[PDB]
Design a protein around this nucleic acid. Structure first.
Ligand SMILES: NCc1c[nH]c2nc(N)[nH]c(=O)c12
Ligand SMILES: [Mg+2]
Lengths: 613, 1316
DNA sequence: CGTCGAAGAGATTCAGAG
DNA sequence: CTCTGAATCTCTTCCTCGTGTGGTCAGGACG
RNA sequence: GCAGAGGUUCUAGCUACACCCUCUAUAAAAAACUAAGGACCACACGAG
């Protein structure tokens, strides 16, 4: 009764169950801003009972606590009015069940709703990794004044935009808004309203709502592109830029500081995330929360008007597939006849069969992809012209909304070669897709992989949990207590290449840290950057011009402060783009950020030059 | 031809492959298995009799007293299923055993017994199995899942890899008995055989051989080929056989008769060995350097001093050889050691052997078996012969003998159950062969090595355990008591056998609670076979190759359905056609194939017999003449599909759905979606709560008319005839003349079970499906059960579904639902819930049940009668008072918060001795009157039927009908009926009727007594009252809703009807799904089911339009015939020209809602037929129509998909999820929340949430999560006053859990304190 | 009426040659 | 011959929240 | 409970952290003050 997961140390001392709690299922909750979340009335009444008693006593409605309890149980009209007072500016903590990393438990401002489900802003349904297939979040309440202020200055959903693991944003638009934006930012070579001149976005939105011009149409518009080139000043330039009606409508949503070279492209998913990141970088936080809240409204509203549905005719089966199948059968038959003649060995024939089947699978996949994306053909007011497809299955893959080319390979082309439970590749691959019928044997073979993948969940999670626990309890005590070690030595940093393209440039690893010795310009005896200056984006851009490969960087391994790392030795906080404050608990942050990707992580001649040089 | 109910709604069927074998009775695995456990077997094998035989010899040790079992029978059950469910007493039957006791004379084993004592004794209370295969234990329906455990016998593992960390393989053998101790032979890296019993410490293998009276010479001869040397004056000439020389390098040049064949230092070739054999030379010369390295075979002694020259199994010594040479033993023997082939793994083990005699080996065995126990010359002997060679302490089953003799390549099947001396050495030789290279290891996961154990075998084993305990008692009693002084009942006790059977049935890892969420959940739960339980593997001990699906699962078990989570792949469900062998293994039917023609007679093939054969595939086109139509047919020979010729095959699959389970076979277009999603599609059907108005599936597989009938929900008529009187609670059928017995046939009555609580708080209701005068055929459904329409499984309700994003209200898995769904009440399910108030007998006086509740108002007592019981029919809500119970100085039962239902019935149980109150008297009198009315109504209707039968004979024999009317109808005996063959039958009928009257006048009193008698109860309770609430849960944002194909998601908004999108004609859709879930998770079947549903509803709309206006019957008939033909060839081919043109107008009514469509799983409808069906009506071929936005009113570009999809409502409703609490009861460790459940609780601020708090800078909120909120006796009571005061302060205190840990360490002899 | 499998570190075992 | 490493035996731990059912000592007289 | 005693009520209500009132031998005129006994094990389920 001391040791183990049942003992005191891990059941009653660390994880104490708490009062003022709750639980419910999740709902889309789209309308509430990303700083607020829904809450059923029948739950917020029970959570905030002492506050209601106190407010009733202040009003004089209840002489004693007994009468207050009676009137609370009555659920009459006065009680709801009181509840709409203690709920005004009282954050609550929406905590997901398996909180792997720091963003698991966030704060929200309640908005009372009827029903019996907890709503949730869609843009934060990614950090939680919370689906909507009946997931269950628990609601906590901060009681003391300090707790209320903390759940406002640290935990509000508008305060942690960038994840602590990496600087990239964590509120990237996920499924429907991204598809809507992608369908908005496109072009059909001939749609009504082509070649016209538009006064501005205020007029483009009207010309589209009237139905006089289609959403996609190459036109000429004028745009007031605001520039921050003057330090602290907004320079307004207006040039007649050529773009689509859909892109022009999207211009009004974006703030003024950003340039126009972002909303002009096809706007997949990574483009949207980069747009948010640049907005945060060059505009701050306050004008980025509004932008990220407005982008979801536009994306939903123009994915609803799209009617992006999936039909059987979408998943085209390439015509070349039958011929490819026949020729692959002929090649495997030739190898079989050779083996029956004793020319080749069993293993050699097996390897040849595997290789030719892989080649045929790649060939049929290429044929299907080329018949899926390009094959759209329309008129340009004259002869026929080529244009990227509008197939819904293709639009859900190019935009990155949901699914990649690998899954579509399983929907139209052949499934490929499947693995036996012991790790071997079966000789005959499954030559049937999902749109077509799947045979009995080709399904009994397929069930092996599904069973193995589903059984690996119950071990991947069980091992990642233990690794995370060990990593948490090994650091567990690192806190940035001193502002400057004053040391000199720091570990070297160089780009890492395996022989292909550069895996990580020096502009990626070094950014966010502090140099050890004075980095020198390629022209010798020239100190480009001092020895103890932090490296932000305006410095990394300079480092690109001079093209320096080796830069010394101070790191927490060479710091000399006992019982805690330095502030300079740790570099950028990676959550807010400023030097880490004196005190932040960095011991647990790293353990959580390393043990978090442990769920999706898989548990298991002549060298030709790349380029001239 | 078609049955009458088949003609009511005949389902359009797809499919091209004509099935041959109808699906068997689904539950026939449990019913038959239990039928072999209580039914009499003169054979007495695997029967209650086969269990008695072994434990019934009864012999007092040298006491000349004998008792033998003779016969047994089961008494009539005291209570029926219905009458025992309410009382909670197990549905049991007394076990009466006849025992014969005889007394011999003193010291006369052969002498005749002086007297015979025979009587019938009552022992045990064995339960019984209901008609559906469910055991009743304590008023709760319980089902016992079959187990799948490693079969008794012998297995040779390999233990490849990690052992010894040097790339070596350690072969091992085990002898697993059915009841006994495991015996394991295991090799070692040093190549020494080691015997290990019961997983104890190791032991050299020869030790267990020495214990079997085996000499060293015998042991050596039993494992090796001896090479014979003969002393000669010719350089010690030796006999060399070429076969042994094969595989040996030429140590020295080999010559015979002065001619050299194989050169020295050259590897001997097979050609060289062949020419040696051709020369047929026997003796070959050998240097003395080759014999010295040869280990001797037999002990050689000198005849002068008598002592032994060289010991056997001793390496030859040249000086020892010289002593042997001078002694002159004409024959010299050595064993043929050959590291390549005949590895000497016995000689080295014998060197390791520490003993030399049998007694020493037995002493070592006793020392190892029982450590710390001093040896004894007799104790070891008894223990060794008891461990293995004892009939009682070791028993291999007949299946064990079969498997053990098959693995050893024997010929016989039946043999002794105890291990034999030769069997052990045969196992040893097989292991040595495995090591040498011959033979192969056996795969554990092979489904030919895991038998199935149903309920009957487990019950028999438990009965045997009870029997051996009672036998140990009775034998000891028989020795002490004087002979023939008492009846044989006194020596035996019923309870020891009972507390052994009832313990198994009640509490076990296999006697699981039965879930009744659906007619399919019951079916798939009585079929599930699990590998857990006693004698099986646990979750922690479960590896990863066991969970994987073996190649030998094809047709024997479902490769799709397995519960996710911890026990994944361990509880796989049985297939649809698989039927258990006689030994326990699994069998799957196949069709016998002659040289060219595939016959009709089918064969059941075992798990191992399937291997050596070649089996064709169900998707093999046939000419209907029996010959295959192509030249190359795919098959499955060695677990690897390939192509073969027509003449090679000799077996084909019986059907196309024989691989999948029952539930997984209900998914239409199953083959189109990935197995990962079908695994959840088959797991989200057994959780679909039954709705209010059950609706047939617009697109179903075709196995819906076989799950409703085969389960128990429906009420199939067992006799054919006509319906005489239907009603909402009873159906009376008048049987025909031929189908009825000549005497006492009468008529048949079915009683329908009205609203009764199920094990999952869902309603169980029966609704009539017929009308007066409608003929009813044999084996036909006429009582639709819960979630069942027209005898066709119907779990959900088909809904018009459109795939499109709608303003984010169906974001990533949400499901938008129109107001039209709630308005039609298409998903408002019933939820019957049961409450119970108990009146205990505490000190200071028992509690009162009265209605005089102190300190309560007049409002609460309005809903209470005089006796303190709520009126049957009131509408109670949360917090209302149900029954009044005042504790002896307010403990009255109250409705739990949130529940708002109507009381449907109240049943009051009273203990004998205490007085029944007024309400109890009212209930008892009501039940008595109802019982009398039932016994009178049955007689009135039966008399009507019987007298109707009597008139058939009364008109045969020249008897006028009017005179029979003149005399009283009840008694026609006044007239003299003409003598005939029917007069005697009628007189027998009348006499049986009179005897029946005398029987009823006693059964009435029996029922009177049964209702009136005070029922038994737990000790210390006076009366217990049960109150039933019937809530009607509606649909709500948050309630789960899942399709059949594996798509799930909660409802997000109940949109008003006008806001929904609508097609051109004006009909608004009812559900708006999110398409973005289809490409990521390949469940593409559902997109290909919506089109079929839309086609079906389009044909339904066309039929409805033809019906709404008056139309000639021929118009409807020709259109429906066209619809049923539908282009591509199908198996069904149903004709409408034979219908009488009046059943067509009824079929049209049953089809106007939309014609159902069948689709067998793996030969379903091709997309061409779907396109043709779509073109049969009007809807566009592609399957997408131009919707219109509801709010804006504009048009939707890129037209979207519309159609009808079957959508179940999962029972994970949101009303059972919200829990939030502020303050309440605390635990012993003062961790206040006490655990979120029915009792108040706070969600656990778990270990990871503390880290998530520490990652931020938040510490004050962490402190308030850890001290004030959770456990601080001076913190909670302080801040509860601070908050209501107005200031939100904090005081940490220090958690009580730490003051508990301090005590739990201080009480350990360790002083832990705090400084200051 | 109280009352009498796995898998890995580590600590035993244990060993081999110059 | 005495550590040298080299087998060999023994103790440890193997996610994290919920939703629910059912079953259960200790130790029966005893004066 | 100013100390002792009694107490409206809005379970019980000088301690649970408690608290207040009136009164002088014993209960009766009055408003403001609080939140309680719930262990272990098997089976099934859901999500990450
Ligand atoms: N229970 C009697 C009574 C009435 N008012 C009271 N006020 C206080 N502070 N305490 C009490 O005990 C009472
Ligand atoms: Mg989910």
């Amino acid at each position: 009764m001391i040791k183990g997961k049942q003992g005191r140390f891990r059941q009653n001392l660390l994880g104490k169950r708490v009062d003022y709690s709750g639980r419910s299922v999740i709902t889309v909750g789209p309308y509430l801003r990303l700083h607020q979340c829904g809450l059923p009335k029948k739950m917020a009444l029970e959570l905030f009972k002492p506050f209601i008693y106190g407010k009733l006593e202040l009003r004089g409605l209840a002489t004693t606590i007994k009468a207050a309890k009676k009137m609370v149980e009555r659920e009459e009209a006065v009680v709801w009015d009181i509840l709409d007072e203690v709920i005004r500016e009282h954050p609550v903590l929406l905590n997901r069940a398996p909180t792997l990393h720091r963003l698991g438990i966030q704060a929200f401002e309640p908005v009372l709703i009827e029903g019996k489900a907890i709503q949730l802003h869609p843009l934060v349904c990614a950090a939680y990794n919370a689906d909507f297939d009946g997931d269950q979040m628990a609601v906590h309440v901060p009681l003391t004044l300090e707790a209320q202020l903390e759940a406002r200055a640290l935990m509000m959903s508008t305060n942690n935009i960038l994840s602590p693991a990496n600087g990239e944003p964590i509120i990237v638009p996920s499924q429907d808004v991204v598809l809507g934006l992608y369908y908005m930012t496109r072009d059909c070579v001939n749609a009504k309203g082509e070649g016209m001149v538009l006064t501005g976005p205020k007029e483009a939105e009207r010309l589209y709502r009237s139905g006089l011009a289609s959403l996609h149409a190459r036109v000429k518009v004028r745009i007031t592109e605001y520039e921050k080139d003057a330090n602290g000043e907004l320079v307004a330039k207006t040039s007649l830029k050529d773009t689509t009606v859909g892109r022009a409508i999207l211009w009004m949503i974006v703030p003024k500081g950003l340039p126009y070279s972002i909303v002009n492209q096809a706007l997949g998913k990574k483009a949207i995330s980069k747009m948010l990141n640049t907005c945060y970088r060059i505009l701050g936080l306050k004008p980025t929360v509004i932008f990220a809240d407005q982008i979801m409204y536009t994306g939903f509203a123009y994915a609803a008007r799209s009617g992006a549905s999936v039909g059987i005719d979408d998943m085209v089966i390439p015509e070349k597939k039958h011929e490819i199948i026949s020729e692959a059968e002929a090649e495997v038959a030739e190898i079989q006849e050779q083996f029956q003649s004793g020319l080749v060995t069993a293993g050699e024939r097996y390897n040849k069969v595997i290789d030719i089947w892989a080649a045929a699978n790649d060939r049929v996949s290429k044929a299907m992809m080329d018949n899926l994306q390009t094959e759209t053909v329309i008129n340009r007011d004259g002869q026929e012209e080529k244009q990227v497809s509008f197939n819904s299955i293709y639009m859900m893959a190019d935009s990155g909304a949901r699914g990649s080319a690998a899954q579509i390979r399983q929907l139209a082309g052949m499934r490929g070669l499947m693995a036996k439970p012991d790790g071997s590749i079966i000789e005959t691959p499954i030559t049937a897709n999902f749109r077509e019928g799947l045979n009995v044997l080709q399904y009994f073979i397929s069930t092996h992989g599904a069973r193995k993948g589903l059984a690996d969940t119950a071990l991947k999670t069980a091992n990642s949990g233990y690794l995370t626990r060990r990593l948490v309890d090994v650091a567990q005590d690192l806190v940035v207590t001193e502002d400057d070690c004053g040391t000199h030595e720091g570990i070297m940093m160089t780009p890492v290449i395996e022989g292909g393209d550069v895996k990580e440039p020096l502009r990626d690893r070094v950014l966010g840290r502090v140099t050890a010795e004075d980095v020198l310009k390629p022209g010798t005896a020239d100190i480009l950057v001092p020895r103890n200056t932090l490296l932000h984006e305006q410095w990394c851009d300079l480092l690109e011009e001079n093209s320096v490969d080796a830069v010394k960087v101070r790191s927490v391994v060479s710091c000399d402060t006992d019982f805690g790392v330095c502030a300079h030795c740790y570099g950028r906080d990676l959550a807010r783009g400023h030097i880490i404050n004196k005190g932040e608990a960095i011991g647990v942050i790293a353990a959580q950020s390393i043990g978090e990707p442990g769920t999706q992580l898989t548990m298991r001649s002549s060298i030709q030059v790349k380029n001239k040089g | 031809v078609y049955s009458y109910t088949e003609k009511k709604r005949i389902r359009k069927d797809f499919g091209k492959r004509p099935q041959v074998l109808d699906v068997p009775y689904l539950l026939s695995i449990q019913l038959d298995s239990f039928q072999k456990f209580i039914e009499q077997d003169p054979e007495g094998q695997y029967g209650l009799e086969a269990a008695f035989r072994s434990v019934f010899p009864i012999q007092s040790y040298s006491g000349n007293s004998e008792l033998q079992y003779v016969s047994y029978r089961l008494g009539e059950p005291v209570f029926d299923v219905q009458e025992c469910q309410i009382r909670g007493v197990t549905y049991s039957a007394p076990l009466r055993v006849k025992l014969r006791l005889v007394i011999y004379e003193r010291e006369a084993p052969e002498g005749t017994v002086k007297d015979i004592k025979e009587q019938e004794v009552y022992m045990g209370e064995i339960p019984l199995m209901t008609d559906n295969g469910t055991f009743v234990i304590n008023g709760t329906e319980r089902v016992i899942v079959s187990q799948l455990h490693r079969s008794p016998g012998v297995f040779f593992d390999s233990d490849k890899g990690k052992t010894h960390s040097s790339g070596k393989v350690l072969y091992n053998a085990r002898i697993i008995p059915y009841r006994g101790s495991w015996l394991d032979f295991e090799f070692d890296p040093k190549d020494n055989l080691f015997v290990r019993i019961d997983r104890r410490r190791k032991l050299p293998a020869t030790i267990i051989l020495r214990a079997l009276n085996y000499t060293t010479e015998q042991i050596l001869d039993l494992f090796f080929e001896k090479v014979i040397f003969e002393i000669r004056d010719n350089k010690l000439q030796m006999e060399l056989v070429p076969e042994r020389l094969r595989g040996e390098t030429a140590s020295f040049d080999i010559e015979a008769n002065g001619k050299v064949y194989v050169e020295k230092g050259r590897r001997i070739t097979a050609r060289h060995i062949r020419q040696l054999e051709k020369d047929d030379v026997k003796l070959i010369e050998v240097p003395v350097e080759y014999i010295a390295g040869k280990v001797v075979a037999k002990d050689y002694i000198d005849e002068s001093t008598g002592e032994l020259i060289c010991a056997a199994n001793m390496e030859l010594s040249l000086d020892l050889l010289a002593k042997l040479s001078q002694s002159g033993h004409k024959r010299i023997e050595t064993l043929f050691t050959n590291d390549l082939d005949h590895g000497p793994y016995i000689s080295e083990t014998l060197r390791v052997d520490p003993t030399n005699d049998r007694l020493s080996a037995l002493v070592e065995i006793y020392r190892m078996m029982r450590p710390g126990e001093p040896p004894t010359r007799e104790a070891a002997e008894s223990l060794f012969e008891n461990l293995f060679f004892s009939e009682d302490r070791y028993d291999l089953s007949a299946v064990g003998r079969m498997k053990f003799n098959r693995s050893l390549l024997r010929e016989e099947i039946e043999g002794s159950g105890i291990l034999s001396k030769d069997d052990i050495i045969d196992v040893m030789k097989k292991l040595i062969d495995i090591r040498n290279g011959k033979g192969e290891v056996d795969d554990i996961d092979h489904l030919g090595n895991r038998r199935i154990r149903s309920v009957g075998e487990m019950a028999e084993n438990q009965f045997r355990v009870g029997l051996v305990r009672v036998e140990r008692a009775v034998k000891e009693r028989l020795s002490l008591g004087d002979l023939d002084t008492l009846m044989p009942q006194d020596m035996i006790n019923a309870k020891p056998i009972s507390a052994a059977v009832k313990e198994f049935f009640g509490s076990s890892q296999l006697s699981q609670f039965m879930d009744q969420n659906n007619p399919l959940s019951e079916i798939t739960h009585k079929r599930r076979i699990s590998a857990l339980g006693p004698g099986g593997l646990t979750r922690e001990r479960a590896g990863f190759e066991v969970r994987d699906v073996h190649p030998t699962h094809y047709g024997r078990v479902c490769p799709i359905e397995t519960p996710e989570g911890p026990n994944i792949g361990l509880i796989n469900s049985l297939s649809v056609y698989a039927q258990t062998n006689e030994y326990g293994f699994l069998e799957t039917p196949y069709r016998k194939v002659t040289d060219g023609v595939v016959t009709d007679e089918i064969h059941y093939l075992s798990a191992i017999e399937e291997g050596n054969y070649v089996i064709a595939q169900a998707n093999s086109n046939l000419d209907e003449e029996g010959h295959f139509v192509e030249d190359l047919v795919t098959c499955r020979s060695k677990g690897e599909s390939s192509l073969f010729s027509r003449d090679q095959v000799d077996y084909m699959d019986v059907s196309t759905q024989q691989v999948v389970s029952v539930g997984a076979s209900l998914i239409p277009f199953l083959e189109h979606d990935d197995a990962n999603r079908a695994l959840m599609g088959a797991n989200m059907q057994r959780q679909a709560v039954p709705t209010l108005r059950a609706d047939k599936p617009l697109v179903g597989t075709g196995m819906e008319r076989a799950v409703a009938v085969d389960s128990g929900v429906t009420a199939v008529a067992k006799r054919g005839g006509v319906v005489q009187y239907v009603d909402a609670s009873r159906i009376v059928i008048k049987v025909n003349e031929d189908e009825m017995y000549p005497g006492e046939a009468g008529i048949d009555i079915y009683n329908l079970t009205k609203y009764t609580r199920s094990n999952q708080n869902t309603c169980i209701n029966q609704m009539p499906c017929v009308s007066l005068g409608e003929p009813v055929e044999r084996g036909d459904v006429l009582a639709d059960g819960p979630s069942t329409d027209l005898g066709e499984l119907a779990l959900g309700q088909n809904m018009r579904v459109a795939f499109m994003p709608w303003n984010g209200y169906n974001f990533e898995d949400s499901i938008l639902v129109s107001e039209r769904v709630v308005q039609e009440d298409r998903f408002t399910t019933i939820h019957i819930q049961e409450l119970a108030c108990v009146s205990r007998d505490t000190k200071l006086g028992p509690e009162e049940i009265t209605a005089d509740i102190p300190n309560v108002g007049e409002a609460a007592l309005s809903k209470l009668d005089e006796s303190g019981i709520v009126y049957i029919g009131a509408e109670v809500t949360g917090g209302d008072i149900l029954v009044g119970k005042v504790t002896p100085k307010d403990s009255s039962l109250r409705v739990p918060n949130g529940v708002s239902g109507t009381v449907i019935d109240v049943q009051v149980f009273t203990r004998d001795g205490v007085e029944k109150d007024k309400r109890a008297l009212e209930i008892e009198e009501m039940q008595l009157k109802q019982a009398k009315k039932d016994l009178s109504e049955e007689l009135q209707i039966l008399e009507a039927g019987l007298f109707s039968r009597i008139r058939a004979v009364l008109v045969a024999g020249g008897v006028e009908a009017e005179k029979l009317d003149k005399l009283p109808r009840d008694r026609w005996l006044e007239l003299g009926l003409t003598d005939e063959e029917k007069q005697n039958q009628l007189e027998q009928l009348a006499e049986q009727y009179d005897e029946l009257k005398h029987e009823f006048e006693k059964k009435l009193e029996a029922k009177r007594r049964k209702i009136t008698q005070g029922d038994d109860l737990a000790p210390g309770v006076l009366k217990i009252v049960k109150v039933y609430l019937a809530v009607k849960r509606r649909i709500q944002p948050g309630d789960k809703m899942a399709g059949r194909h594996g798509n799930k998601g909660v409802i997000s908004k109940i949109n008003p009807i006008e806001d929904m999108p609508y097609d051109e004609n004006g009909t608004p859709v009812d559900i708006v799904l999110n398409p973005l879930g289809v490409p990521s998770r390949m469940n593409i079947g559902q997109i290909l089911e919506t089109h079929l549903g839309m086609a079906a509803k389009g044909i339904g709309d066309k039929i409805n339009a033809m019906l709404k206006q008056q139309q000639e019957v021929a118009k409807l008939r020709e259109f429906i015939q066209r619809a049923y033909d539908l282009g591509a060839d199908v198996r069904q081919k149903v004709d409408l020209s034979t219908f009488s043109d009046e059943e067509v107008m009824r079929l049209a009514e049953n089809l106007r809602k939309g014609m159902p469509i069948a689709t067998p799983v793996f030969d379903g409808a091709k997309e061409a037929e779907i396109k043709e069906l779509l073109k049969l009506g009007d809807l566009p071929t592609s399957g997408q129509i131009r919707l219109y936005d509801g709010r804006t009113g504009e048009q939707f570009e890129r037209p979207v998909t519309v159609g009808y999809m079957y959508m179940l409502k999962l029972n994970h409703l949101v009303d059972d999820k919200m829990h939030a609490r502020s303050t309440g009861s605390y635990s012993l460790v003062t961790q206040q929340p006490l655990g979120g459940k029915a009792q108040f609780g706070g969600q656990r601020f778990g270990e990871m949430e503390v880290w998530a708090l520490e990652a931020y800078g938040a510490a004050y909120t962490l402190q308030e999560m850890l001290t004030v909120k959770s456990d601080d006796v001076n913190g909670r009571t302080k801040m509860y006053k601070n908050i209501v005061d107005g200031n939100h302060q904090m005081e940490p205190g220090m958690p009580e859990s730490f003051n508990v840990l301090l005590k739990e360490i201080r009480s350990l002899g360790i002083n832990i304190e705090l400084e200051d």
